Amino acid sequence: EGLVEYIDAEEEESILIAMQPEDLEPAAKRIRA
Amino acid sequence: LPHFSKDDYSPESKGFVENSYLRGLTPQEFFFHAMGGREGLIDTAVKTAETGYIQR
Amino acid sequence: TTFRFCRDCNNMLYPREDKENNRLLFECRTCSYVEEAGSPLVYRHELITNIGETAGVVQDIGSDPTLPRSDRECPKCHSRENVFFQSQQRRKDTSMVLFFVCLSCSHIFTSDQK
Amino acid sequence: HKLRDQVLKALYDVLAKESEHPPQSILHTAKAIESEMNKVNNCDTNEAAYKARYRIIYSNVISKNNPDLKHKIANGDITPEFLATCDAKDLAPAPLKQKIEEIAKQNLYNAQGATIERSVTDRFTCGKCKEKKVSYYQLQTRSADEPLTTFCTCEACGNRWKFS
Ligand SMILES: [Zn+2]
Ligand SMILES: [Zn+2]
Ligand SMILES: [Zn+2]
């Protein structure tokens, strides 16, 4: 039903990637478009 | 790396390492650290054979 | 500098000189069609170029998600949205001039002020 | 007498063609014969460099930029001076002059090379002069069993050393 998707070693240059599920998704320990 | 937006020369972009060891890293800095280490290992493992030949 | 073709037969025209009337007459080597030349320019080597930073633009560059976005405006439509990206030429001496393309005015403009 | 008639006819042409007309045509041919008789004083039509100085002065007159060279050469700036001048860069005109000095400044800068500047501190001490002006620099050389080298160099005199 399409919730995950295989992406090969070749495609990624059409794709922006997020590190975390909320890294910028809403619009001392450590330091973190 | 494919994880930033296009055409940047920021210290994050090329990957100047911000943090110390103690607070941790980001995975990008982890990857660049592995890059520099692996370069050190390959240059050592070739230069040992070449220096052995020239010494003999 | 362009390469004209014989309209009767789509073949590469060559320059050849009139023997007495002193004019360049592009005669076809396939058929007998001939044509006088507009300029005495024939050949051009151009050993130095600096060109190629700009083109490759499609009408929907901004449809791709991977390009970054900024807030400098287009100086024709004044809309604050934009798409910016660097040179499309890659030599070892190409510049850090930037190219800014908008969606509203659909126009290309730069950030140089010399 | 081919050269001493040809250059005289050349100065006849480049003085009659002026907006400064010749009603003193006898004065202007006196100027022309003075120009040619100092012009020969370098060569006397016996040296190959005669035509070069003639080409310099001739096309400086016919340059336009500038036309004011005709006015200043007819109202002064005497012709035996203008063999010994060799002021071809200096005259006709001054905007092209200031262009040339900007070009020369740019070339003199760009022919200079690499000048990596070697940031210093007072943490260590030299061996030769024993000064704390250490041009330090840091890098790794050996195998995995150690950290960096602690490379050292003094910038006050030039003394390179190393710390253990
Ligand atoms: Zn034809
Ligand atoms: Zn606009
Ligand atoms: Zn010293």
- What is the CATH-assigned architecture of the largest domain in chain C? Single Sheet
Instruction: Kindly estimate the percentage of residues of chain C that lie in beta strands according to DSSP.
Output: 5-15%
Number of helices of chain B: 2
* Shape type of chain B: elongated
H/E topology pattern of chain C: EEEEE
Strand arrangement within the widest β-sheet of chain C reads 3-4-5
Largest pleated sheet of chain B? none
SSE order of chain B = HH
Shape of chain C from CA axes?
Answer: elongated
Helix content of chain C: under 10%
- Whole-number radius of gyration of chain C? 23 Å
Number of domains of chain C: 2
- CATH domain class of the largest domain in chain C: Mainly Beta
Helix/sheet category of chain C: mainly beta
Q: Tell me the span between the first and last alpha carbons of chain C.
A: 32 Å
What is the count of helical runs of chain C? 0
- Summarize the largest interface: chains and residue counts: A-B, 12 and 9 residues
Q: Structural class, judged by helices and strands of chain B?
A: mainly alpha
Q: Report Rg of chain B.
A: 17 Å
Report the biggest beta sheet of chain C as strand number plus sense, adding barrel if it closes. Answer: 3 strands, antiparallel
Subunit structure (chain A): Component of the RNA polymerase II (Pol II) complex consisting of 12 subunits.
Protein name (chain A): DNA-directed RNA polymerase II subunit RPB2
Family (chain A): Belongs to the RNA polymerase beta chain family.
Subcellular location (chain A): Nucleus
What does this structure look like?
The structure is cut from a larger assembly and holds chains A (33 residues), B (56 residues), C (114 residues) and D (164 residues). With 33 residues, chain A is low in regular secondary structure. With 56 residues, chain B is mainly alpha-helical. The radius of gyration of chain B is 17 Å and the shape is elongated. Chain C is mostly beta strands and 114 residues long. Chain C has two domains: 1-45, N-terminal domain of TfIIb (Single Sheet); 46-114, N-terminal domain of TfIIb. Helices cover 0% and strands 13% of the residues of chain C. Chain C is built from no helices and five strands. In chain C, a hairpin with a 6-residue loop joins strand 4 (99-101) and strand 5. Chain C starts with 24 loop residues before the first strand and ends with a strand. Chain D is mainly α and 164 residues long. Chain D is 45% helix and 6% strand. The longest helix of chain D is centred in the N-terminal third of the chain and has 19 residues, at 25-43. Chain D is rod-shaped and about 95 Å long. Chains in contact: A-B, A-C, B-C, B-D. At the B-C interface, loops of B face loops of C. Bound molecules: zinc ion (ZN) (3 copies). One zinc ion binds next to loops of chain D. The PDB classes it as transcription. Keywords: pol II, Transcription. Composite map of PIC_delta_TFIIK form2. Chain A is DNA-directed RNA polymerase II subunit RPB2. Organism of A: Saccharomyces cerevisiae.
